[PDB]
Amino acid sequence: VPTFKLVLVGDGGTGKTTFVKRHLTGEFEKKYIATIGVEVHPLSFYTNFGEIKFDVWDTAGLEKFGGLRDGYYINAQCAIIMFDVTSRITYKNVPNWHRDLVRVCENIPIVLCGNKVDVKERKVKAKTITFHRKKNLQYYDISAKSNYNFEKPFLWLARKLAGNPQLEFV
Amino acid sequence: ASQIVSALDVIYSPKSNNSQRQEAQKFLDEVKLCSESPFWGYEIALQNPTNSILKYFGLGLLDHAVKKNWNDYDEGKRVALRKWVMELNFGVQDYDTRYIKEKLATLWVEVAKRTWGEALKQTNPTEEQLLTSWVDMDNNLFELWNINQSSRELALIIFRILFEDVFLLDDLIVLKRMTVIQPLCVMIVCPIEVFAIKYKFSDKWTKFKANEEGWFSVWIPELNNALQQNNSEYIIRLLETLKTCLNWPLTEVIVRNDVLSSLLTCLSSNIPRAQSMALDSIHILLTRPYSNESHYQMTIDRVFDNMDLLDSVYESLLFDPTDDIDETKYPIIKKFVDMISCLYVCVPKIKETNGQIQKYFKLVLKTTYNPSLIVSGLTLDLWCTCLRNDEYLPKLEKYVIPDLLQFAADALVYYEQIDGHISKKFAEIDFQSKSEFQTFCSTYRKRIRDIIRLISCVELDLTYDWLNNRLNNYFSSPFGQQVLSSTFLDHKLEPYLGALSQYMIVECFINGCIRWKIWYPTGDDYDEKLDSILQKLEILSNQLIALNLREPLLLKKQIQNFALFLTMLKDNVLFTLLEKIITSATMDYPEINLEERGAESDAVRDLRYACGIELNRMALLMPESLKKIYPDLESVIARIMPNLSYHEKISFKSFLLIIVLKSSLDMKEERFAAIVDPELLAWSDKTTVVGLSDLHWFMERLGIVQIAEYFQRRDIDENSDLLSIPIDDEGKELKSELTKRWQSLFPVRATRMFIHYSMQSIKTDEEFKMLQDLWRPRIVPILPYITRLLYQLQSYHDPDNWKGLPTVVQSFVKYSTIERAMQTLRDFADSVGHIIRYTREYTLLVLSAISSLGSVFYLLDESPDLLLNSIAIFKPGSNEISPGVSTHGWKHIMNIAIRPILKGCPKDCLGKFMPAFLPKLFEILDLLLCQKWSSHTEEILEENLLRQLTTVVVRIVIDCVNNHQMEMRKIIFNDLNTLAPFLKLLNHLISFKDTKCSFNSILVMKCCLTSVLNTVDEYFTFEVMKNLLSFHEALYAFTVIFLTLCKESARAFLFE
Ligand SMILES: Nc1nc2c(ncn2[C@@H]2O[C@H](COP(=O)(O)OP(=O)(O)OP(=O)(O)O)[C@@H](O)[C@H]2O)c(=O)[nH]1
Ligand SMILES: [Mg+2]
């Protein structure tokens, strides 16, 4: 059985921990607790070609709380950059997160996720999102409150890692 | 020394619990915060070369020390940190992982940004000052460049990071140090003599530069030597570092080392990363600012002389998408096409000597053929811009336009609706939704139609010759034969879509011909050319009509294209085309029944409806043109009338009416009467006139009595679930009979069409008065009947009215009242309700149009009473306003009648209409809004409807309190009968839950408070102040009222 280390990075309060939790269990937490350090969460998927596991290293999104702010990316095999559509400061910081994410792990697949799309007021309009196509990243519009595309990033990462674009969750 | 290693093992071990990781992280953070953290980090990094994680942690300690405590350290400690960083960098070896070298470079750059060159800010700085400023940085870097291969990579990383921070990124430290950093970075790369040309700086700067020849003279030879040796990794590293140091440096360095040749050589190499970085670098060189334009000319000439190389590169990048798109080359293809599309700006600056421009445009066209729409879409804007600008037009006219036209024609298809189109393979990669693909395809087809429109505008003769060849070939093809034979295509399969694309191409050609009238210079030759264009358009129209196409949706597109035609043609040629439009569009279809509501009958109904719109629009635009043709159009319409339903009969009569009125034909009154009176005569029918006052007679005419007979015959129980009970043939027959009876019984649509188009395009006040004298004899007599009809539809919603109705239909009518093909009896009741609502909307629109007649309607004394008493519906005992009428109904009533009827007042009639209308209107509105708010998903929808109604009411208030408001304020404030209801309305509005309504009402009150305070005082004191007691301004208004009322028992009551 494969096992790919996945590092989830993004600004604090963007929903990284909520997204990871809702993938671990059906619950969608609403109270916000700033992750301190890193949360390691073995997350598994079943696909037509077998099973895969992502060691989702959920990193803290705040400077005060990020212990090994870049040491967590060491030996990473894939990564996810989460930014809040409702808050435009987070998107402004996406280039920074990618910049210091590719320094450690160079050629890993990276997925840019626009979280919290359910709300009626998204300051980061889809028209203004162009970083993903600038760096050739796969971009998705997800919300861990509606399960809009929660599984899409993991499917894309699994396809890239396994070299099997026909791979599909079952 | 070992606790740190154990903590790191805990942190990185997959088996550790998050609590254990957090404890270890607490320990590591404690270590990081220690006073001697940087020295421990340096020791760890030096003494643990084999342990990558531990060395990275030590370097992280150093990075935190330099990056977060630099101000605290003294000069000695800063020099110590610089020495430690240099010692670590010089110790790099082949076993250091990539991320270790990145961190070492980060440390070096972080020290340099803060210490490099600060001594230069002084004058003739001492040796100590220079050393404190890292005078030897460049010499050290050159030394680091020769230690071994691993260090050479590290030096490249250092340069990449340094130039990225200093120039590309908006780093804060360099933002402060810019004036001395940016000149220094340029100094090290540029040769000394070249640097002196641009900058006047003194000799002290020379001490900071080691290699007299600069760095480019080191990188570029290395890049060429790596290309010769085909060293892929080294080439990629050099391009990465070299890609960040091309925008800023002095152009003389770029030219002297011939960087662009090296970039082109990299591009020719089959290394995807190298090709991508070479494309980025070439784009940077093209778009970067140039102080000396000779160098820019050299750059563009070098790029354009190598169009064969670029074509070869594109050919190499291409791949077969049938199996699977090569994700390693598709991004590079997009990058290449994007870079190419920006070159056309440089075309006019290039002296074509070896066919450079022809090769460039051929390459751009070839890229446009790319299967991916995004790749194609990049160059579409290029083609539109080039065609519009005459600078490039002579060059395109020779090379591409003949082939670009063919491509545009072939690419004007519906990609999404095609089965397994090659483009859709790229869709799931570039777009994450179907809707994204649909909208992008719509935009793509729009831009494609722009290309065909402009190509036909410019090369009109060539396009027309090409068009006829295309149409003749197509309609002889099997698909063309199917289209010309069939009468109802599937609207999703190939024949219809192909024919539709052909007609879109014809539309684009017609639009181009129209634009040509504006594009072509108004020279002497203009008239002959325009006559030739008109003859060509006539020939094309005769060709298309001769096909006897029958498919409605295609026949509608043909009719609309001919509508575009008609804006130009004139005289008899206009009539021969217009008559064929009328006859073909209104031709009957025996193969189908025109009342079954089938998907193949709605097509015909829409077709016949499209002509009415086009004919009326054309008549409005060109009445004088149709004046002399009218004698024949009248006969044509008379011949076509028998096979037209009432709905379209009215439209064609309206077309004739428009021609009669706006064309200045003789004896307008007689023709007008001949056209209008037969339709409006239904209003004056004695049976309708007398029975319209009886609700029961209204129900019977609506057919509810017959519905009761039908239900009784089918023994439909009063409580039987009509939701499931099916409809039969008799039900459909009865519904059709009633609808046919209903429309002709109350010709509201005919009245609204005739009045609206009659007053559509008034030119002079005399014409307006003439029309008034024309409508007055036949509108005033029927106004009571129209208002009664609106009254009945209003009382039809009152539950008590249908109490005497038979019990079997009690549920049916109740369903009809409920708001929001027909196969179940519940759908039958819903359709009856739709009929009632439709009649209610049109009878409102009739009243608005009668309002447009100005003095005819307003200056009539009884009009206010009629209108309000017909919309009020006051119960005998209860104060309910129009019981059982939906809030959406009130919203429509207000918006579509009261606002137009108020804003449409004549400024010379406000003295007779408003006094007898504003009091009652305000009382009704107050009573209605209070009742609606007295009661306060389905509930949320009702709340939203109430919000919309309140917004409309406020808008009415705002529009009543410019030229119009100036008189309306005077009218309102000088009559208590109008003021007191107005104050009641304001008091009710301010207190309602909706924030926007209260805010706007408070603004209105502030606007007019000074003019009203002059039993108004009593009402203000007792109700306004109490009710009020947005927040700040509301309190301001309250205090404004108080300052006068309590200054002149009011204060005691307020205190209470
Ligand atoms: N509207 C909306 N809000 C969400 C969604 N997901 C999370 N949130 C909110 O955003 C907050 C994010 O919480 P966390 O995920 O724990 O914070 P984080 O993303 O890990 O950020 P850090 O812990 O600082 O690294 C939650 O408390 C939620 O209230 C979502 O899908 N839609
Ligand atoms: Mg978190």
CB contact at 8 A, A144 and A138: no
All residues at 6 or more sequence positions from B783 whose CB lies less than 8 Å from its CB, including other chains: B850, B857, B860, B863, B866
* A115 labeled binding residue: yes
Task: Report which secondary-structure segment, H or E, holds A43.
Answer: strand A38-47
CB contact at 8 A, B940 and B885: no
B13, two tokens = 């071990």
> Does ligand 1 come within 6 angstroms of the Cβ of A145?
yes
- Which of A37, A40, A165 comes nearest B324 by C-beta? A165
Residue closest to B138 by CA, chosen among B234, B213, B239: B213
* A16 labeled binding residue: yes
The Cβ-side half-sphere exposure at B445, using a 13 Å CA radius, reads: 14
Residues in chain B: 1056
- Which of A55, A70, A140 comes nearest B432 by C-beta? A140
How far is Cα B601 from Cα B112, in angstroms, rounded to an integer? Answer: 79
> By three-state DSSP, how is residue B1052 classified?
helix
Which ligand is closest in space to the CA of residue A34? 1
- Which of B14, B29, B52 comes nearest A67 by C-beta? B29
Question: What distance in angstroms lies between residue A17's CA and the mean position of ligand 2's atoms?
Answer: 4
> Does ligand 1 come within 6 angstroms of the Cβ of A33?
yes
Instruction: Please report where in the chains the tokens 């095999």 appear, as a residue.
Output: A77
Residues B874-892: b if buried by 16+ CB within 10 A, e if exposed: eeeeeeebbbbbbbbbbbb
B170 — contact with chain A (CB < 8 Å)?
Answer: no
CB contact at 8 A, A135 and A117: no
Which residue numbers in chain B precede an interruption (C–N > 2.5 Å)? 820, 936, 961, 1014, 1029, 1048
Q: Do B98 and A71 touch (CB under 8 A)?
A: no
How far is Cα B839 from Cα B92, in angstroms, rounded to an integer? Answer: 87
How would you class B800 by CB atoms within 10 Å of its CB: exposed for 0-12, middle for 13-18, buried for 19 or more? exposed
Backbone φ, ψ for residue B995 (5° rounding)? -70, -45
> By three-state DSSP, how is residue B746 classified?
coil
* A14 labeled binding residue: yes
Virtual torsion, Cα B615, B619, B625, B629, nearest 10 deg: 60
- The single-letter code of the amino acid at A123 is K
Residue closest to B245 by CA, chosen among B302, B274, B288, B191: B288
> Which numbered atom of ligand 1 lies nearest the CA of A12?
24
* Domains of chain A as residue ranges with CATH: 4-162 (3.40.50.300)
How far is Cα B246 from Cα B267, in angstroms, rounded to an integer? Answer: 17
How far is Cα B1007 from Cα B1018, in angstroms, rounded to an integer? Answer: 20
All residues at 6 or more sequence positions from B652 whose CB lies less than 8 Å from its CB, including other chains: B612, B615, B637, B640, B641, B644
End-to-end CA distance of chain B: give it in Å, rounded.
79
How far is Cα B796 from Cα B817, in angstroms, rounded to an integer? Answer: 8
What are the start-end ranges of the E strands in B601-682?
Answer: none
Nearest Cα of chain A lies from the Cα of B88 at a distance, in angstroms, of 18
CB contact at 8 A, B538 and B580: no
> Which numbered atom of ligand 1 lies nearest the CA of A62?
24
- Which of B14, B103, B432 comes nearest A55 by C-beta? B14
Residue closest to B506 by CA, chosen among B549, B553, B470: B470
* A164 labeled binding residue: no
A62 — contact with chain B (CB < 8 Å)?
Answer: no
Instruction: Please report where in the chains the tokens 């002149």 appear, as a residue.
Output: B1048
DSSP class per residue in A71-131: GGGTT-SEEEEEEESS-HHHHHTHHHHHHHHHTTS-S--EEEEEE---SS--SS-GGG--H
Which 3-state string (H, E, C) describes B906-949?
CCCCCCCCHHHCHHHHHHHHHHHHHHHHHCCCHHHHHHHHHHHH
Distances from the Cα of B565 to the Cα of B510, B532, B558, B650, angstroms: 7, 14, 10, 25
A139: nearest CA in chain B? B432
Q: Solved how?
A: cryo-EM
A151 — contact with chain B (CB < 8 Å)?
Answer: no
> Does ligand 1 come within 6 angstroms of the Cβ of A15?
yes
> Which numbered atom of ligand 1 lies nearest the CA of A119?
1
Chain A residues with beta carbon closer than 8 angstroms to that of B14: 40, 55
What is the tally of helices (H) and strands (E) in chain B? 58, 0
Domain extents for chain B?
34-214, 583-665, 678-853
How far is Cα B552 from Cα B603, in angstroms, rounded to an integer? Answer: 6
CB contact at 8 A, A28 and A22: yes
The Cβ-side half-sphere exposure at B426, using a 13 Å CA radius, reads: 23
Residues 83-112 of B with CB under 8 A from A: 98-99, 102-103, 106
How far is Cα B560 from Cα B553, in angstroms, rounded to an integer? Answer: 11
B890, two tokens = 């009130």
Q: How many CB pairs under 8 A join A and B?
A: 49
Virtual torsion, Cα B587, B590, B591, B594, nearest 10 deg: 80
How far is Cα B140 from Cα B117, in angstroms, rounded to an integer? Answer: 14
* A30 labeled binding residue: no
> Does ligand 1 come within 6 angstroms of the Cβ of A36?
no
B336 — contact with chain A (CB < 8 Å)?
Answer: no
CB contact at 8 A, B274 and B240: no
Nearest Cα of chain B lies from the Cα of A50 at a distance, in angstroms, of 22
Virtual torsion, Cα B303, B308, B309, B310, nearest 10 deg: 70
How far is Cα B566 from Cα B123, in angstroms, rounded to an integer? Answer: 82
B325, two tokens = 């798109």
For ligand 1, pick from A32, A62, A119 the residue to mutate: most ligand atoms within 8 Å of CB. Answer: A32
* A90 labeled binding residue: no
Residue closest to B815 by CA, chosen among B695, B715, B719: B719
Q: Do B25 and A141 touch (CB under 8 A)?
A: no
User: Which of B10, B15, B25, B168 is most worth mutating to test chain A (most A CB atoms within 10 A of its CB)?
Assistant: B25
Q: Whose CA is nearest to atom 20 of ligand 1?
A: A17
Chain B residues with beta carbon closer than 8 angstroms to that of A157: none
In the DSSP assignment, the letter for residue B1046 is: T
All residues at 6 or more sequence positions from B988 whose CB lies less than 8 Å from its CB, including other chains: B926, B929, B930, B933
Question: What distance in angstroms lies between residue B136's CA and the mean position of ligand 2's atoms?
Answer: 44
> Does ligand 1 come within 6 angstroms of the Cβ of A30?
yes
Task: Report which secondary-structure segment, H or E, holds B668.
Answer: helix B668-680
In the DSSP assignment, the letter for residue B1042 is: H
